[PDB]
Design a protein around this ligand. Structure first.
Ligand SMILES: COCC(=O)Nc1ccc(O)cc1
Ligand SMILES: [Cl-]
Ligand SMILES: [Cl-]
Length: 182
């Protein structure tokens, strides 16, 4: 009821519509992206600095690191929202890589609608330090977007892009998009 056709609008970028949302995947360095929200995949202490999290916390800067540890010591959080620091975004949403990936992506979408944001960029959440399997992660990310659209929740959100560190993981995402296409 929701999926469009898979195509390539730019070299190495693959896209398809899911309802009103353009869903894109590409390999590369997420810290060079511009979007309303960039997602970080981190530990339950919000202070991992290994893999994608290292790149994100180093580029964002020390004020963002301090925002993370301050919120961490205030309550038990499933995720936290900070400033963008020196990343090209309005906010970073830091999710726990070991948590249910569908749940994490649902929360990111909801928070973006609350702020009337249009664009999101995320990594292949949980495939690094958390060692979740790449096709289970791809299935969960795309399932969350489908559910959000099915419920009529997409209003401000128009683009969701996964920027993936390993080309081998990109290949898994592309196969999952082809499975779903109209
Ligand atoms: C979240 O799990 C994937 C991950 O850590 N990816 C990753 C990103 C950048 C980098 O420089 C090394 C690795
Ligand atoms: Cl992770
Ligand atoms: Cl990644």
């Amino acid at each position: 009821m929701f999926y469009g056709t898979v195509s390539s609008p730019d070299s190495g970028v693959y896209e398809m519509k899911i309802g009103s949302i353009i869903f894109q995947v590409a390999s590369g360095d997420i810290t060079k992206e511009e979007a309303d929200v960039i997602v970080n995949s981190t530990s339950n202490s919000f202070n991992l600095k290994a893999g994608v999290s290292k790149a994100i916390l180093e580029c964002a800067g020390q004020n963002v690191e301090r925002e993370c540890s301050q919120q961490a010591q205030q309550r038990k959080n499933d995720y936290i929202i900070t400033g963008g620091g020196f990343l090209r975004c309005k906010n970073i949403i830091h999710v726990i890589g070991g948590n249910d990936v569908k749940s994490s992506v649902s929360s990111v979408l909801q928070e973006c609608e609350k702020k009337n944001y249009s664009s999101i960029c995320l990594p292949a959440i949980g495939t690094g330090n958390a060692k979740q399997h790449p096709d289970k992660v791809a299935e969960a990310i795309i399932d969350a977007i489908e559910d959000f659209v099915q419920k009529g929740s997409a209003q401000s959100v128009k683009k969701v892009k996964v920027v993936i560190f390993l080309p081998q993981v990109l290949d898994v995402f592309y196969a999952n998009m082809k499975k779903r296409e109209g």
